Structures are given as structure tokens and as C-alpha cells.
């Protein structure tokens, strides 16, 4: 959805509202995204450093 990022995609146990697409934390960074083709929610984990 126009957001470009790099990370590892994993399935999520959280449930969004059917109108929100982006998951954010208190630190205000993107960590959960809804796939545009199929309706599911995925967590993003930065690869190790």
C-alpha cells in the first residue's frame, strides 16, 4: 500500500478492525500490515543486527 520496508513476515494473533490497515506501537513505528489481496494480518520483525 505504498509503504516500503524490510523485515520478516510472520502470522499474527491480533485482530484489526476491518477498516484499519497499519499496526503501530508506542514508539510509533510500523509493525503490523494487512495484505491487500487476501484479508489477513501479518507482523513485521526486523532482521537481526
Amino acid at each position: 500500500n505504498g509503504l516500503t520496508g524490510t523485515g520478516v513476515l510472520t502470522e499474527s494473533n491480533k485482530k484489526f478492525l476491518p477498516f484499519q490497515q497499519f499496526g503501530r506501537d508506542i514508539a510509533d513505528t510500523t509493525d503490523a500490515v494487512r495484505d491487500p489481496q487476501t484479508l489477513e494480518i501479518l507482523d513485521i520483525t526486523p532482521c537481526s543486527f
Binding site: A27, T29, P46, F49
Partner: protein, 32 residues
Amino acid sequence: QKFNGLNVLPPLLTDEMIAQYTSALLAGTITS
């Protein structure tokens, strides 16, 4: 670890061995 380049490092002394020092000091005080 953390989000953007931040990193936290563990202390050299485990809390268990800290408690061990405290116990040794207390035993020395109460005995000698």
C-alpha cells in the same frame, strides 16, 4: 534486539551472585 540501532548490554554480575555476596557479608557480620 531493539528497534533502530539501540542496544542494551547485560551487567557483568548476575543478580544471584550479588545476593550471594550480600549473604556472605551478613553471615560474616552475625558470626565474627
